[PDB]
Amino acid sequence: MASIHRPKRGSLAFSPRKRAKSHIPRFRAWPEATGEPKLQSFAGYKVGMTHVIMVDDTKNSLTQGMEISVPVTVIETPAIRVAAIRAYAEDSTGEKAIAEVWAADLDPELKRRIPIPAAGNQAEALENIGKLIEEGRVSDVRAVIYTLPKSLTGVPKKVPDIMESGISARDLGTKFEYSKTILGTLVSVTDVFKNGTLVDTAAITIGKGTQGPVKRWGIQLMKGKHSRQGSLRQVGTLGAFNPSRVSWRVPQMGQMGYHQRTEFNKRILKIGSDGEEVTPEGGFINYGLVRGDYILIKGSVPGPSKRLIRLRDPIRAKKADLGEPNILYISRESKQG
Amino acid sequence: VIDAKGLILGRLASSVAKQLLSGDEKVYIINAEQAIISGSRAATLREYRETRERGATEFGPYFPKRPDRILKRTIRGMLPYKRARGRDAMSRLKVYVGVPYELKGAETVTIPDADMRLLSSSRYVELGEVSQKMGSKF
Amino acid sequence: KPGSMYRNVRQRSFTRRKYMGGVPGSQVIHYDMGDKANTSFPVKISLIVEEKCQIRHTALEAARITANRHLVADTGKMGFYMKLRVYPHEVIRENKSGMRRAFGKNVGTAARVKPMQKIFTVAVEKQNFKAAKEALWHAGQKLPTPCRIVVDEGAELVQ
Amino acid sequence: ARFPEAEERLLNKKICMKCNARNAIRATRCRKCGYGTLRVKSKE
Amino acid sequence: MKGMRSNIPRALNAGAQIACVDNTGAKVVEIISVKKYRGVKNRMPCAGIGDMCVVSVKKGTPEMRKQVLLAVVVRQKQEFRRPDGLHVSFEDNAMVITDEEGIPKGTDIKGPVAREVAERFPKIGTTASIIV
Amino acid sequence: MVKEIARTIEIPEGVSVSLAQDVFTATGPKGTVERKLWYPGIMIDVKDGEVVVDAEYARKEQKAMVGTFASHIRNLVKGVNEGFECKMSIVYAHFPMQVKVDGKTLIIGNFLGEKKPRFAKIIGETKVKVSGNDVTITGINKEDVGQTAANIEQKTKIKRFDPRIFQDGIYIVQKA
RNA sequence: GCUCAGGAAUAAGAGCUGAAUGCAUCUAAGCUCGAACUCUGACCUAAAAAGAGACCUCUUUAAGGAUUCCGGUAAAAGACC
RNA sequence: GCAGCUUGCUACCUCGAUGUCGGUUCUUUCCAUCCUGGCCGUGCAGCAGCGGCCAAGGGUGAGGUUGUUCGCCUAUUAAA
RNA sequence: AGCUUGUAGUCCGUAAGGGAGACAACCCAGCCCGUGGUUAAGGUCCCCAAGUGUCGACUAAGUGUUAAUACUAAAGGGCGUCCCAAGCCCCAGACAGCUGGAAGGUUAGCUUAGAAGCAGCUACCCUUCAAAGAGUGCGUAACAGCUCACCAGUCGAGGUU
């Protein structure tokens, strides 16, 4: 038999396609430190999409210098609290948590997530971590941070979300000093990301529940006469006669969406403080209006509205210093029109 | 506590397996990355990448990557590990890359007949080299 | 039709041509090459097969052609004497329905040779020994058996 | 032009007549396959 | 080829009979294949504005008819977006006969051409009376 | 006559050779060099300004290994004593090669008109000098000098065209 | 809308040093390069890894969890938030 | 000599049935590699060929006739 | 052909138990029940009872680690490595490298004006010489420097078929 070839339906790069074990994306890698100390990640909540008219500043592009309409995602980004500093020791079996110091004073609504750590050992915990770093038991340092969604109104929840973030510094001592400076403080998104820079966005995608292989993997439907013989939206064959089994690579029904996904190289087009600049007439549908500080991300982002979106400094960015975008018009017309 | 540095992999495994089946001791093996496999580097790497990428690794053989876990697997192949006796033997065995901190400074032993200087040539590679060429971080 | 077909000896002889019908004639024309009248060649090598096999007349003709060409090129037209000792006496038959009445029809002739049996003998002078040896190696490359060259006369003349 | 010192390294090697591998100018046998006949690389 | 500023959906697939709108003598040409287009299994060759297709002259003069030619689509009913966010659509689909290089066989083009084709092939723009 | 497998290497004055562990180390006026020379069945002794390399057995492998080890010791002592020099020429037809040294690499710009320069790696403490149309490569390690010259010659390879017409490159005219 | 890489180690191959075999030799040791391959690296999943993990906090008739209630960023039942 | 992918030979399994060709859908594997990557030779100036080696990660499509497999033909295509 | 059809012996069929991974018919063995011992076949690094057994060599290919069996790839080749033997040269200095001459012959005859030793068909070409041919090479429209087959000094031991 002389066969016609096709690329495989869907990607096996995301198998098993199960539901994410948490509603928060977890970062498995952190990029290289390339400058002054700072947090490598922030976290906001997706609001919705709008579009801007901007001058194409992208070097070498055909439309560079002319007016272009660019879709943007609005992400409401209230200040996060640096709740703790955690130290990690590297050994043959990998990284292990070795020490943690919690900030002396923490927000009372953190009790919705965890019983509040007391204002106990912070000075001696920090000196213990300093001794550990001096004696070489510490491989690196991360900052445990959490969001404060109570200030938002389109997100109904008041329980904070907690996550670890890397610190970008040239040396472990510099990392420890910066973490001590930022410990217990409220960091704004301008203290993590700058306008016009590329970032990576992680989020839990839109949940679709249980979906068939046609929607879930993009398999072809039965065609022509076969379309009305009783197996229309349904895979042609589960396998060969031998091997006597259904491969895991055969497209099948199952959970669709509500997965963790990372998008790369999303450009920040605006860091705003007043949500009236971006909120349309009538508000964002099912969300409301922006009230705190916000961010405009060029293009689309994984997740629906109100989903927690984690932003991190780019890990596979190609282009060098991009610049500050020239946003000439932010559309606030009614999205419900 | 056996130091696997400069020891033939199969002969050390046979010795430790027979000791475990004699069944009066817990055996610890340290520096598993420093064990020796005789034969040409190309042939050993070829056979080990074949064994690593062989099976139906979604639902088939799962060949380990770390050198200590590979040595544990090699000893497992010389045991009745599906039996209660072999299960106890494998439960009484611990293998380490380098020296674990708790065993640090403990008195070690070496198998004289497993020593690598009894080999007649230089055609050998280390288990750590095999593991890191298969992509194991240790 | 590969020579591996009628190569192994598994059977009795089949040579009495008066009880068979229609054997194709052999392809081998001459059996004595070089200078046939002279016999005072000092060196005399031979090619012996080392397995019990059947050699078809076409294989014999190919080996004879290659050896004769090499000898004529190196030693000259009358610088050598070459003798092909064996004649194709066995009749090779083929089954040309299936396996009913499978006794075959005669398709050719072959020589049934034994281990250490001489196939070709080449007589030359002292200075032509290596050329004869090389030509006979080329001839042995065309035969369906492993072969070896042996010196029959002139061992002290060569070394 | 053609430079002799470049020609010595580029065109002054033998080629195996069965696998085409380059061999030394003095080599009587291919290193890759051991073939006994080697031709000089054809520089014309 | 040179990139266009707009995003063009490949709207016309193989078998479409498009009106030919130059003075070459071809009235209706059927798309046979699309140049520089590699497909996938079961997918018909697709062409949007700015694409060059191999066509067969179905109507027109008898000299043009049954000839395999090259044509460039200059009008398509499927809407396409300019870089500045405005969507453009024509009232019909329309093509013009050209060579491999992009030169039109005709001399005048009745009807408006797309600015995308007018820029990708500058001679189509000069041949056309108006570029929209 | 009697086949002797052992080989002797004279140690010139000012040269201190040691074989602690299984590593040879030669110190001389021009520098110091260290190599690993270990093979089972081969023994090396240093004594009184003279190194002797012998094989316990006498098979062809041991003969080859004693020869190779003696040659390596000779090359190491010669490198620490007088060093090694390798001469290469620069030839081109139409594009003038821009050859320079940027540290531990050699930059070869405009090679056959290319807009991207070639990079040739330098090995060890090998000194490369571009003295106009020629390159001199001096060092204390024959291995390092030979590999630097090989790196240059392979970086200047014309991997596309007919070698009988295109002959641009940097070629060794004298080995170490 | 986003979706280059880089590095390591190699195949064929090209070389360095180098004896057997005074010379020569890419090879017998040794060494450097060398692919859309392999590994690593920017992704997903992964304490049910039986060596069944690390750290911190809170609290030991408590911490906290579930059920009922109003819901939806989730959802076939469960679950999840 | 290899393979067992053509056709034969044979009758060991199945006649208290292992549903028969071709297509379609979907998955996987081999390399004796068509393209894509790296090489070597050339009767290799370049362009482009011809021959061979490594390499199975990806690709290998759309159509007219014919049930076709196969094959013919068409226009694209890096290759179909 | 694990095909078909004979013949002698022995088996399975109807044959346990032990051993070969499993194995109708391959090896031991024909086998009443229980106990003890010693053996057969086969095995003795672990899985697995008993050798990380001894002596002398070979193999570098994970070759192999496969009595018989249809369950184990051929011709050809290898300056891969280990052996035996026989020729020839060799401290009256072999083989390979380091040196120095390849000066008299001929520019041998070759239609077309031109391949004047490498298109080409032929020799006791010098008196004689420790040394120089009717021709081994990137190169010559007709000429050459630059490379050989040769004795010479060289360190100094085996070389070659």
Swiss-Prot record, chain A:
Name the InterPro entries on file.
Answer: L3_arc_euk, Ribosomal_L3_dom_3_arc_sf, Ribosomal_uL3, Ribosomal_uL3_arc, Ribosomal_uL3_CS, Transl_B-barrel_sf
Tell me, what is one Gene Ontology molecular-function annotation carried by this entry? rRNA binding
Any single GO CC term annotated in Swiss-Prot or TrEMBL for this entry: cytosolic large ribosomal subunit
Highest taxon of source: Archaea
Print the keywords alphabetically: Ribonucleoprotein, Ribosomal protein, RNA-binding, rRNA-binding
What is a biological process (GO) this protein takes part in?
A: translation
Q: Which Pfam families match?
A: Ribosomal_L3 (PF00297)
Q: What does this protein do?
A: One of the primary rRNA binding proteins, it binds directly near the 3'-end of the 23S rRNA, where it nucleates assembly of the 50S subunit.
Name the PANTHER family for this protein: 60S RIBOSOMAL PROTEIN L3-RELATED, LARGE RIBOSOMAL SUBUNIT PROTEIN UL3
Matching entries from HAMAP family are given as: Ribosomal_uL3_A
Protein name (record): Large ribosomal subunit protein uL3
Identify the species of origin: Methanosarcina acetivorans (strain ATCC 35395 / DSM 2834 / JCM 12185 / C2A)
Swiss-Prot record, chain B:
SUPFAM superfamilies named in the record: Ribosomal protein L13
Q: Which GO terms describe its biological process?
A: negative regulation of translation; translation
Which superkingdom, per the lineage?
A: Archaea
Keyword Ribonucleoprotein attached: yes
Alphabetically ordered keywords of this record: Ribonucleoprotein, Ribosomal protein
Give the family, as the similarity comment puts it.
Belongs to the universal ribosomal protein uL13 family.
Q: What does this protein do?
A: This protein is one of the early assembly proteins of the 50S ribosomal subunit, although it is not seen to bind rRNA by itself. It is important during the early stages of 50S assembly.
According to the record's subunit comment, the protein's assembly and interactions are:
Part of the 50S ribosomal subunit.
In Swiss-Prot or TrEMBL terms, this protein is called Large ribosomal subunit protein uL13
From Swiss-Prot, chain C:
Q: Does the keyword field hold Ribosomal protein? A: yes
GO CC aspect terms: cytosolic large ribosomal subunit
InterPro entries, sorted: Ribosomal_uL16 (IPR047873), Ribosomal_uL16_arc (IPR022981), Ribosomal_uL16_CS_euk_arc (IPR018255), Ribosomal_uL16_dom (IPR016180), Ribosomal_uL16_euk_arch (IPR001197), Ribosomal_uL16_sf (IPR036920)
| Organism encoding this protein | Methanosarcina acetivorans (strain ATCC 35395 / DSM 2834 / JCM 12185 / C2A)
Q: What is the lineage of its organism?
A: Archaea, Methanobacteriati, Methanobacteriota, Stenosarchaea group, Methanomicrobia
Note the SUPFAM superfamilies from the entry.
Ribosomal protein L16p/L10e
The alphabetical list of record keywords is:
Ribonucleoprotein, Ribosomal protein
Q: Name one GO biological process term.
A: translation
Q: Which GO terms describe its molecular function?
A: structural constituent of ribosome
Is Calcium one of the keywords UniProt gives this record?
Answer: no
Protein name as catalogued: Large ribosomal subunit protein uL16
What family does the entry list?
Belongs to the universal ribosomal protein uL16 family.
Swiss-Prot record, chain E:
| GO annotation (BP), single | translation
Q: Name one GO cellular component term.
A: cytosolic large ribosomal subunit
Matching CDD domains? Ribosomal_uL14 (cd00337)
Gene name of this polypeptide: rpl14
Q: What is the lineage of its organism?
A: Archaea, Methanobacteriati, Methanobacteriota, Stenosarchaea group, Methanomicrobia
The alphabetical list of record keywords is: Ribonucleoprotein, Ribosomal protein, RNA-binding, rRNA-binding
- Protein name (record): Large ribosomal subunit protein uL14
Give the multimer and partner information: Part of the 50S ribosomal subunit. Forms a cluster with proteins L3 and L24e, part of which may contact the 16S rRNA in 2 intersubunit bridges.
> Which species expresses this protein natively?
Methanosarcina acetivorans (strain ATCC 35395 / DSM 2834 / JCM 12185 / C2A)
The similarity annotation says: Belongs to the universal ribosomal protein uL14 family.
What PROSITE patterns does the database record attribute to this sequence? RIBOSOMAL_L14
InterPro entries listed in its UniProt record: Ribosomal_uL14, Ribosomal_uL14_arc, Ribosomal_uL14_CS, Ribosomal_uL14_sf
UniProt cross-references to PANTHER family, sorted A to Z: 50S/60S RIBOSOMAL PROTEIN L14/L23, LARGE RIBOSOMAL SUBUNIT PROTEIN UL14
Kindly list the GO molecular function terms attached to this UniProt entry.
large ribosomal subunit rRNA binding; structural constituent of ribosome
> What does this protein's UniProt record list under function?
Binds to 23S rRNA. Forms part of two intersubunit bridges in the 70S ribosome.
The UniProt entry, under Pfam families, shows: Ribosomal_L14
